[PDB]
């Protein structure tokens, strides 16, 4: 028969759809898992969707994935109450069976599910407390701790009066009665979490709003025979904006940094006032630009802007990246606009920070001395850079830093003797030629 | 203007001993409404 055929692989594929969704169920996938689960017929695979949750809960590989699982149950119970209705039934029977079997591993797997379902308003507090009464009737104290650690946060909010009475009888256990040792420190740990106010049992996937979850708080008790509907999981036979072309937000902020800059006396004073502002990290690249441009209005270098920038760098590392991004942005892009009177300010400015290790020598590896990849104003900037390196450190201390720099931009050694002839010619034009003794040895071997 | 400036205050008991550096700022001039009035020292290029 082809209708019994066509309904069977329909029953197979629905079974072969839910089982990989449940295995791929995790946080930040819950809504995507629930969307694809909604298009497959949940109502026909009613016990299929329930059994694939119970076994994936029971398997002991999980226990971690239970709050992802119980959040999907709330998504189903919000959509279809009958799905969370039946799935609340089986977990009652799965507890009462394994409590009678004394399967302590399988009991705790179910009780973590029943806890988080109570965290998501799926089940009532009556079904929770009566389980607690059965566990506290015997010892069963390994199980009741993992329940009340997770659900007692919500449970004291809802039904405080009986929940005080659960605590009071549970307190009578430790104090007036003898207990086994390994169990005992876990029970008083619950009293320790009590004074920490349950802040480590109150984290889950509250995706549904309290009015988005249709409130089907199933008020079943664990003293009801719950119909054990295994039979529907078998196979049967259905005969059935304004565009922003201006930057007035930036101009007002650009005014405020400039007013801060001109209202201070010393460099530590302006450094204080900038750090007082708590500038956001997107603007901290732009604040460095405002400092440097206003350092070019001065018409002379000042030690103000150095010790301004030094207190920036030692404060927090995002300032230090902001100068390192700006020094590349100045050399690769901004040299073409700057006059030679502004280059002697910048070459003395960046030469001050490099010579006192606020910027590393590795930032100088970006700068390369060729005929093609050099600007005539770029050669001016390097010349005013190295003089401040020579004046502060000395000629021998600069020799040590350039040897530890291992850069190729100023120092070609591997070949290309037209660049070696270029680099000796450029450095001796600056006035520093003592460092070029490495290149002249390399040059005459090529000849 | 010359006194709308945070004045450095640092530990007069130990400032006579050594150079402490600028560790705290004393307020120079106040008003109910904040204005960051610039000071001339910025506007006069330095001797060195």
């Amino acid at each position: 028969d082809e209708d019994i055929k066509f309904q069977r692989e329909n029953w197979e594929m629905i079974r072969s759809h839910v089982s990989p969704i449940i295995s791929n169920l995790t946080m930040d996938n819950l809504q995507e898992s629930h969307r694809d689960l909604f298009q497959v017929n949940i109502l026909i695979g009613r016990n299929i969707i329930c059994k694939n949750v119970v076994d994936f809960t029971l398997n002991k590989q999980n226990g971690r994935l239970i709050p992802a699982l119980s959040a999907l149950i709330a998504l189903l119970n919000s959509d279809i109450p009958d799905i969370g209705e039946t799935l609340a039934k089986e977990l009652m029977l799965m507890f009462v069976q394994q409590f009678n079997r004394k399967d302590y591993v399988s009991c705790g797997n179910i009780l973590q599910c029943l806890s988080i379902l109570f965290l998501y308003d799926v089940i009532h507090e009556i079904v929770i407390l009566q389980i607690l009464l059965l566990l506290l009737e015997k010892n069963s104290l390994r199980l009741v701790i993992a329940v009340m650690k997770i659900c007692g946060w919500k449970l004291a909010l809802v039904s405080k009066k009986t929940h005080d009475m659960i605590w009071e009888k549970l307190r009578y256990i430790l104090q007036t009665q003898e207990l086994s040792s390994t169990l005992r420190e876990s029970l008083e740990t619950l009293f320790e979490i009590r004074q920490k106010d349950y802040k480590s049992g109150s984290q889950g996937l509250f995706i549904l709003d309290p009015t988005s979850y249709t409130v089907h708080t199933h008020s079943y008790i664990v003293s009801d025979e719950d119909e054990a509907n295994k039979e529907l999981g078998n196979f049967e036979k259905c005969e059935n904006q304004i565009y922003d072309m201006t930057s007035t937000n930036d101009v007002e902020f650009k005014k405020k940094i400039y007013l801060v800059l001109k209202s201070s006396l010393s460099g530590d004073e302006a450094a204080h006032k900038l750090l007082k502002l708590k500038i956001a990290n997107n603007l901290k690249k732009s604040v460095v630009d405002i400092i440097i441009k206003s350092s070019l209005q001065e018409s002379t270098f000042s030690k103000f802007y150095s010790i301004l920038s030094e207190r920036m760098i030692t404060f927090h590392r995002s300032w230090q990246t902001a100068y390192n991004e700006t020094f590349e942005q100045n050399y690769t892009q901004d040299i073409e606009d700057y006059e030679t009177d502004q280059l002697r300010i910048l070459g003395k400015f960046w030469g001050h920070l490099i010579s006192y290790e606020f910027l590393p020598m590795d930032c100088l590896k970006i700068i390369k001395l060729t005929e093609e990849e050099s600007c005539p104003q770029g050669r001016i900037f390097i010349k005013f850079l190295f003089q401040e390196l020579v004046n502060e450190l000395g000629l021998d201390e600069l020799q040590l830093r350039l040897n530890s720099s291992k850069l190729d931009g100023m120092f070609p050694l591997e070949g290309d003797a037209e660049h070696i002839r270029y680099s000796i010619n450029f450095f001796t034009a600056i006035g520093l030629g003592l460092l070029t003794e490495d290149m002249r040895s390399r040059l005459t071997i090529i000849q | 203007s010359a006194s709308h400036i945070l004045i450095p205050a640092s530990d007069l008991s130990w400032s006579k001993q050594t150079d402490t550096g600028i560790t705290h700022f004393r307020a120079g001039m106040t008003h109910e409404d904040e204005k960051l009035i610039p000071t001339i020292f910025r506007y006069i290029t330095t001797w060195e």
Binding site: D268, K276, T314, F315 | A9, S13, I22, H24, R26, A27
Partner: peptide, 27 residues
């Protein structure tokens, strides 16, 4: 707190005596 920094009084100071820690000088 008044950790040896500040003024004996803001009376003859002609200031407010307001003292704030230098965020620049830390290390």
């Amino acid at each position: 707190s008044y950790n040896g920094i500040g003024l004996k009084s803001a009376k003859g100071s002609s200031t407010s005596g307001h003292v704030q820690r230098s965020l620049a000088s830390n290390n």
